[PDB]
Amino acid sequence: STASMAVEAENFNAVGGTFSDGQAQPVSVYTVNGNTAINYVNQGDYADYTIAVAQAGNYTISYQAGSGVTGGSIEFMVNENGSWASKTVTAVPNQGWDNFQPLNGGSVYLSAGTHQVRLHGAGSNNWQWNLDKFTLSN
Numbered sequence: 001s002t003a004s005m006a007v008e009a010e011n012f013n014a015v016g017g018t019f020s021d022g023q024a025q026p027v028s029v030y031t032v033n034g035n036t037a038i039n040y041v042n043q044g045d046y047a048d049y050t051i052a053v054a055q056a057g058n059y060t061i062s063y064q065a066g067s068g069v070t071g072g073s074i075e076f077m078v079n080e081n082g083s084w085a086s087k088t089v090t091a092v093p094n095q096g097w098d099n100f101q102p103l104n105g106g107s108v109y110l111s112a113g114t115h116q117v118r119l120h121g122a123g124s125n126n127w128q129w130n131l132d133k134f135t136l137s138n
């Protein structure tokens, strides 16, 4: 029943958000120290992923995330019946925008099948967090 899926944050299928950050897209990509990551993530911004799950299970969520402010949080959601269901919300420690640290995101039950996952800038701050990748582990 062991399974592990690392999803690169830069490999979103869509991004969105209202915050005016002056960029071409509401969430941007950059590289630092060979880590490609999403940045310019603001409050209300989100990044959508499609994930194929062979093995049903209660997966643990781990983010490689960083922030340079207090008040960023990653809300992990799954689309269930054309309706986003909030799964976990995780504050991101303020240890520097480029300083990615493993961050425990709680757990989410994923059936065998294909899931739409949303990572949403859920905290109070105008600026939220940067994200290298996240890993789902059973």
Ligand SMILES: OC[C@H]1O[C@@H](O)[C@H](O)[C@H](O[C@@H]2O[C@H]3CO[C@@H]([C@@H]2O)[C@@H]3O[C@@H]2O[C@H](CO)[C@H](O)[C@H](O[C@@H]3O[C@H]4CO[C@@H]([C@@H]3O)[C@@H]4O[C@@H]3O[C@H](CO)[C@H](O)[C@H](O[C@@H]4O[C@H]5CO[C@@H]([C@@H]4O)[C@@H]5O)[C@H]3O)[C@H]2O)[C@H]1O
Residues within 6 Å of the ligand: 039, 040, 041, 068, 069, 097, 127, 129, 130
């Ligand atoms: O006599 C007294 C006055 O003298 C006069 O000469 C002056 O006019 C002055 O008047 C004041 O001037 C300042 C001080 O008070 C206000 C008054 O007008 C004014 O305040 C400034 O106003 C600015 C807008 O006009 C700004 O809001 C400024 O705030 C800052 O603006 C930028 C720079 O630093 C941040 C700060 O909010 C903001 O930058 C953003 O900060 C984010 C962290 O908060 C983050 O780093 C953003 O960047 C992102 O970081 C990582 C995530 O994604 C990417 C992205 O680059 C990256 O990986 C960043 O853009 C405010 O102080 C009298 O003194």
Ligand SMILES: [Ca+2]
Residues within 6 Å of the ligand: 017, 019, 021, 025, 026, 027, 040, 041, 042, 045
């Ligand atoms: Ca943004």
Ligand SMILES: [Ca+2]
Residues within 6 Å of the ligand: 008, 009, 010, 035, 036, 037, 131, 132, 133
């Ligand atoms: Ca990455």
Ligand SMILES: [Cl-]
Residues within 6 Å of the ligand: 006, 007, 008, 011
């Ligand atoms: Cl990926």
Ligand SMILES: [Cl-]
Residues within 6 Å of the ligand: 033, 034, 035
């Ligand atoms: Cl590194």
Ligand SMILES: [Cl-]
Residues within 6 Å of the ligand: 087, 107, 108, 109
């Ligand atoms: Cl769950």
